[PDB]
Design a protein around this ligand. Structure first.
Ligand SMILES: CCCc1ccc(-c2ccc(O)c(C(=O)O)c2)cc1
Length: 141
């Protein structure tokens, strides 16, 4: 399933980003790709992400769910490309790091489920057309 596969990759990435500690072939290769591209993306948007995180004040699970409802509407507006999808997942990694920092580690998995919901609920057909995670891997390399 698209949702299950997406969640496996996204949860693994957010958790390893937060703790600093690390279809299996596709999932493995997508995670590796995401480690490489997500790194440049997080650094490129660092100040912006910090600013957004500040205003949002995400400190518990309810806040995570609250933010996801708004993200769904924003992400569904405008163009769709892999770079924007990586940007969404990178913001998720950024938030995940913040949650670990403030000792709210229990919120990381719900955040991963919310980021995956944002992605799959709004871009399911685009993802299927682009060949899912295999498409992702092929696109970057
Ligand atoms: C009140 C603001 C809540 C909010 C915060 C962040 C986002 C966000 C993050 C990364 C993204 O890549 C995109 C996007 O691509 O649209 C959108 C959307 C809404």
């Amino acid at each position: 399933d698209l949702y299950r596969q997406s969640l496996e990759i996204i949860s693994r990435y957010l958790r390893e980003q937060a703790t600093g500690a690390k279809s299996g072939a596709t999932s493995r290769k997508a995670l590796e790709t995401l480690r490489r591209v997500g790194d440049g993306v997080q650094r490129n948007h660092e100040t912006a992400f910090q600013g957004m995180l500040r205003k949002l004040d995400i400190k518990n699970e309810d806040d995570v769910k609250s933010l996801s409802r708004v993200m769904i509407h924003v992400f569904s507006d405008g163009v769709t490309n892999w770079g924007r999808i990586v940007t969404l997942i990178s913001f998720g990694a950024f938030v995940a790091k913040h949650l670990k920092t403030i000792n709210q580690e229990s919120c990381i998995e719900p955040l991963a489920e919310s980021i995956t919901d944002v992605l799959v609920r709004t871009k399911r057909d685009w993802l299927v057309k682009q060949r899912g995670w295999d498409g992702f891997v092929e696109f970057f390399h």
